[PDB]
Design a binder for these strands. Sequence first.
RNA 1: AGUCCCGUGGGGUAGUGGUAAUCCUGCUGGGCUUUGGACCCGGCGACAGCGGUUCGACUCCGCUCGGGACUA
RNA 2: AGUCCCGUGGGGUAGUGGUAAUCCUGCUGGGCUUUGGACCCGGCGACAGCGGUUCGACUCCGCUCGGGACUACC
Lengths: 424, 424, 485, 522
Amino acid sequence: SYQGRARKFLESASIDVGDMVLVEKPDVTYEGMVLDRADDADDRHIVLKLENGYNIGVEISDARIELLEKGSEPEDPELPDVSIISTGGTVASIIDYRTGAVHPAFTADDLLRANPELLDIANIRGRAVFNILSENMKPEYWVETARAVYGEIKDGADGVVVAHGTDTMHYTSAALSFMLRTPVPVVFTGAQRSSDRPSSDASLNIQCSVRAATSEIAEVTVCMHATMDDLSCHLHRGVKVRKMHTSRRDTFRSMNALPLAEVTPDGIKILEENYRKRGSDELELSDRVEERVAFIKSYPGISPDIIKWHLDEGYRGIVIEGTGLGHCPDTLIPVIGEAHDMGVPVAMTSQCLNGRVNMNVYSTGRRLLQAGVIPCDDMLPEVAYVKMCWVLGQTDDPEMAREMMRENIAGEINERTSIAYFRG
Amino acid sequence: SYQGRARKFLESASIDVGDMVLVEKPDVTYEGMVLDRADDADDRHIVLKLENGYNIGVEISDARIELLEKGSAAEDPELPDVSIISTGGTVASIIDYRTGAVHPAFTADDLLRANPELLDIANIRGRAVFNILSENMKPEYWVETARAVYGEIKDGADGVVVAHGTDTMHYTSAALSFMLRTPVPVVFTGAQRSSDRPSSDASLNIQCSVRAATSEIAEVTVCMHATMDDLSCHLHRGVKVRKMHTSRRDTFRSMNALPLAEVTPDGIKILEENYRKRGSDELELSDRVEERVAFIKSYPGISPDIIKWHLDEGYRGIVIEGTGLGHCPDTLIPVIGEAHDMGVPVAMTSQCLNGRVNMNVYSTGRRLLQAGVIPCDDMLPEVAYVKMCWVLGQTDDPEMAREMMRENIAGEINERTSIAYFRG
Amino acid sequence: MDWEKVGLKMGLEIHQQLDTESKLFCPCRTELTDSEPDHDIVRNLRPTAFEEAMRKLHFHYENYHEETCLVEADEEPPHPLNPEALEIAVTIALLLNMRVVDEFHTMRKQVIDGSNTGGFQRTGLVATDGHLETPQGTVKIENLCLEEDAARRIRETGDGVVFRLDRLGIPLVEITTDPSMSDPQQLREVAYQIGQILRSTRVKRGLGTIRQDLNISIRDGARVEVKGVQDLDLIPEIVEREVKRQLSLVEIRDTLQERGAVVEDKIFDVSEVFADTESRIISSAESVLAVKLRGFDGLIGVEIQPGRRLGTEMADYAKKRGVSGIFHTDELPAYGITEEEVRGLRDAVGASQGDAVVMVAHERVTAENALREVIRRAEMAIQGVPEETRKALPDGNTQYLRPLPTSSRMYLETDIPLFRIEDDLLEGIRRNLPELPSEKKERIMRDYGLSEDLASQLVKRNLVDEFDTTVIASLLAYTLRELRR
Amino acid sequence: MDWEKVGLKMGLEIHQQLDTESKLFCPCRTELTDSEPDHDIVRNLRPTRAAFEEAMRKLHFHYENYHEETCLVEADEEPPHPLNPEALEIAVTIALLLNMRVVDEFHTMRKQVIDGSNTGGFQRTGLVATDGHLETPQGTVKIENLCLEEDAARRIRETGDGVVFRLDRLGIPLVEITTDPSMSDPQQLREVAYQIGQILRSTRVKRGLGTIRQDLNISIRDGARVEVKGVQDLDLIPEIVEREVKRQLSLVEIRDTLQERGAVVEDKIFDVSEVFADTESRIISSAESVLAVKLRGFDGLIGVEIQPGRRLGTEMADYAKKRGVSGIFHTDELPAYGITEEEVRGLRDAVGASQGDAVVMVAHERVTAENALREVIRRAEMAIQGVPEETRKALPDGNTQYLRPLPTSSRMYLETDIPLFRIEDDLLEGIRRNLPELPSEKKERIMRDYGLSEDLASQLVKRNLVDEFDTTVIASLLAYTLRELRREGHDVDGLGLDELRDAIKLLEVGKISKDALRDIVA
RNA sequence: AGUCCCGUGGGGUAGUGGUAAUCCUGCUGGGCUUUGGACCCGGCGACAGCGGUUCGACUCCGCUCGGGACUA
RNA sequence: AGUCCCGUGGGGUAGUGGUAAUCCUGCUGGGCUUUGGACCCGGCGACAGCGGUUCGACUCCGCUCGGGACUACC
Ligand SMILES: [Zn+2]
Ligand SMILES: [Zn+2]
């Protein structure tokens, strides 16, 4: 994907990537393989991979190539059945040390090649449903995944592990929680560290998710490192996890709850003792979701207009991420009321993340309640958002949506708040 | 503020709040003081305060009232001078048990009456600049405060304590950090628990803040309970604090840093050792602020339209709260670029809160970087937002603004991230 | 003792635990826990001296990650009113012929005691103007409240008392009655009645469960509340014995003035007077002090109440701060001490033959703080009877505890919304009240061939709702009893 | 020793620390710390079939971290920050000083390294310069490459639960300078190594212990490549080369004789234990079990001195010492060692060995002696072939000693985390025309323009204070006094700190001699 | 008010839903007491009271009353 | 190679940048030896060597000759 002067310079000699070439400059002369050049990067330079192994960038303004060679393009039973689904997350791979380029790999075989330990845990089945970077993920794909998991689980699978990207993983798990009802475990995972790295947390994450996919915990969950150490993983209940760090292996924490368990490639520790057992539920799939849902974080200065523009744009629902306890500027009242007159649900959650909303304590809150706002108890903001999308895809009766929001359905709301839910 | 039916027949007898009356009904008969009835509540009932002390509601559809009676410091020097300003936060009060209603109180003596201990810390001076609920705080008031403090500190004050509301405290402190340069400490504080309560944190917080206000640490800060225990307080660096819990006494936590110190009505323990000393600074005040800055939290499904709407509305800047590491959907690229084509700065921060952004690691990040987004290192989203407001209030040169965002002005950005920064 | 003439005013204050799934304004379960608490919260309550009062407000609360939540800790706002609680609260109300409020409002009863983590108690009136019938006439029930029980103490250290938050929040119903009864026999009748009704609804059954406190009044006497009167059949006696104690003290005051008695806070170290004594108690006592009470002679030993004397009261006030039992002039001629000695103390302390002496054989440090109390009470004797809070003894007598509770200052608990008692749902009980135990007994018998004893036990053990009949019962009322064996 | 005739080909690989304020791809300081680690992190690196159970176990590492002296970068908990400019500048200067051709665009890479010294399983390296050259009496020597890489974490302990590295050194800038692999003249190698050193000392470089590292690669026709690690003293290079040439020649002569007599190496291990039921050597008598192996025709060659002081057997002894064991006993040196002939004849017999071959025994616990003898057989087999490629270390004298095999070919791919760095020619010249003066130049220049004696100027440069420096007084205070303070004080407080002030107060009240006391207080 | 034990010939001490109770000792018949003690064969004499449950309860359940322990 | 210690009359033993070196031992003049010694006056004889700093260097810095301690692939 070279551009401008570069490509022009590189084409005028009929040279492509992979081609062993020889470049001559007034004071230098390199000999290496041409490498594709990232688009972000700008022309004038040609990436060459010298014989010693190092990639180099050379200014062509006064170069002179000469091709020297064209490219080249060379089930024991007695063990549970577990399907490893890839949504776009890569939890294992292989590198071509002849290009410097890393290449994904999501196959029942490849995974095994990289994680032999798996063979003693369960019988792997790992196709790759689809592929979207965790960042570019949207409501539509929540469904597409729920549908994808529903399949594997319907085709005789004792557990399903979804290889999702970190960034949005928690949003997705939320979705799958509301849209899926399961007799078997569905554990989401990924790596904070690219799988191509020898240090990647992918390995422990995967064979711990596989381990969990075996457990008696049959809910949609998230399984990641419990610390920076390569020892354990925490099994987080799907509607109560949140990526709390931008890089740390232990980025995922349970929010208004404690980890449901403590996994290892060898076993589980089930810390939480109240959860959906295995068989207990029957595979149902509510794949209906309303793609259109506002999710507005409140803040000093926010304008009612933003709320309005949303109503005008035909937004069926609004999830506000208020200030501690469930607030938002009084100037928003009118608008929020208007949303009600328009039969548009408006729910409130707190930016604080840690906590239970109580719009009864202060006036600002009560008037907000007076305007039809729906307190969401202690439901994490992004979950309340994910839920509205689901609920407003289950009905169009404002009144009912308000009921279903407050309705604990998968574990999004916890009646009481333990002192143990806010370490630091 | 009764309404409809209630007022109708509460009027038709010429009775006001405070008047002892006697209500009679077909099966009951009460005798008490009429009390103001919150607006949220619907009519049909009248709040009486029986002789026993208990307030009760009585349906008047078949009532009948009858009025029974109409309503009805030192300055020993040798001790630092500290100004206690109140922006709307109430950290001390008195209750009139004759009405059941609690009413604020922010006088150099009222505080003294409720916090005698102060008398040995410093010489209290406590005006009450203005009054706005932390929920309804806006950029214009950040300034008004910025101005207010500059005053006291100019009229000779060894320290200044601002009694602010919890909800948005961190936003404001962030603001005063950028707007003010100081020779003395400026510590914000408040209570998670109403001051009217005997258990309110207001007491320890106020007399620790004042303590702090005498300390050598001279930068804008937040002093609050360090645990649920009534023993210590942490002095948080303003541009690095966040209201992390909905109600807990220890709601305020330092984010990408550790607390600057350990305060007690008797002393401070200064944990951090690299800070702006006392005299070292000369009181300056850049009170200019651009009140229009978009602060959009990214999420699965967010549509370009919101970003455009913002550009169209004439928003001079945008701060995105992206997914870990600093991402946002590929679909907003074009809009983000267009924003650049319009001279509108766009900054990226992560929802994770904890952590440092690196838009170089992944493609999505690079591409976003290619569209002109400004990565904000490890600056909290809300401070990057508060910061944009200030910066676009100091210039209109887009490039200049990108340079200012990235510039660590008051400690908003930490070059390195220590393992001690992510406990749990 | 012709009550109507002495001007006796009696009042009953009963508090009942409700036994609902979750607590009052929280979801936490309604049973205590003996397990080790997972978290000790340190706190300080605040007045509104401010150096020694404060120190008496340091509190450590024991929390549980599971059997406790943030509401108990005062770290999370009160959830709304517990419906089931208000249900039984109303049921009981209706059963007492009270008038259920139209709109229930939760209050904050100022309580800087430590028993609650907030600095106050959440209470709300549910009904009023109720009434009951006793052979002696119709008795009125003033108010019925639904409040949260307080936290229970567990330890007292140099760093203050320690409370456990498990009992805090357990739903309570405070039932009050006219504070002017006049007929002790009648009070027992209402106490009983109330008991049978409370026992006719979903209510806690067991130890800490019930709590009855009656207040005895005497014309020209004083207001005094009797705390924890376990046995109801014993009410008339403790009353009678109280009235005796009031009248008895209305005389000890006039005598003290008749002889213009004076209380001197002068403590003497009358130790050398017992260098060689004939009483183990003192000879083995570290040091020994004594105090003189001018003109108090002959009245410290006067039996104010059947079995106990003023000196006993004094012994009571002195007991605190540590000490076995005070020795005194009017009872000291004996106790294993000769008059040659009795005359030795009167002399060393410089006491006329019209006044008396009160000695304390213990370690100097405390005996001093003990005698300062006997003085405090001595001075009160000059004034007379004080309104005070006392407890009931094994027999009918009582014992000093602490001053009379302060006027209950209280404002509105704004965190909890109002509750309108749907007139429509109110009759949905009004005409479905529960049968008293008495009625359960008979009915079961009547329609199950169960003998009186069997139906009795079944009801007594509340297994009626559970239950060849005679067998289904005999293994719920008889064998399941051997179960707890 | 007719170097060009034996086909001697030498090479030099020098690694140098930089002394930059911040590390290379992170902001942490570039100094080590003795303080107690704030956090120990447990990790496991990963390979790439019956060993994926034993290999893994050897990849468990504990990393020591510091809340201050370390960040998430060193821990592989936060992506590497962009290339440290200051580093690249020194790197470039150095390169230019070598007449190298600085690259147009700098690209960071990941040299595969599952050694444990790197927290990510790789080392970040990048090529900065190439095709450079030096001038030596012996002729012009070319300098092949110049790279900027992160130094590795350092080892602290080894326990049942694997190795323990400290992250303080992880990340410190480094420049790998490689020279032509075919030198040919020992005296020439020392000349290059020296000049390089003097050039490195001409730029902002760390001075001290761990600081530099020099590894020569000796070779000989029909011999083999051998890397000699850590040759602290350059003056001794000639010597260690010559001595290495001998060892490969000796090993070669030994190859030819093993063939003269068609020697054979049988991996048959014998439990020659009963042969010593009643022995006269504590070493064995107290030894758990005892095994031995025969090497056909190897007689008389295991004890031949291949190098002044060490024998082939020593090599074998070293190959075998790994896997645990004191030192192997063998036919050509076993007539003694507290064992009589009647015993010597007893071993030869029990092992079934002719009078032309020899035996190598191991007195230890059966489980390992078996693993140890398996190695002496491995090396024995190598002797048949000749000189084997290995990594050795230099000893006090000119000899060397076996350490481990030779480094495998360096597999390496792109470090996508860090951006590319374009080296604008404009700023490249603002250097090439301002290269630093060598130490020698500094000394004379400073002498010639300050009246400083050779001695005072020599020291002032030696101690890197020329930049700081009656003149002969200001110097005699940093070249003489300050060194005396490193014996009664902590002068490492602030050069230019108290100095600035105090140096002034010598122009008014404060006799010359007061200095070595005034500043001291500070 | 609580919960847990005990409440057995005159006194003591074991033992028990069943065709119901131990020896010690007191009292008293006979013998021997080589005509005192005392030993030796025996006799009189109990399982607190009212219920329920039971084919039959002291021993199961409750309740009176009495002795004992602990808990608030 | 790095850090570092020691090198004082003939024998041992202290201690020191200064107008310069401690006793025992050796050797020698006298006194007292009622022509031993002991004791008392007094003599002889050392700072390892070259530089740099210094007003002056065994004494601070460096290099040698001499002995040594310690560390020398990650
Ligand atoms: Zn609770
Ligand atoms: Zn670092």
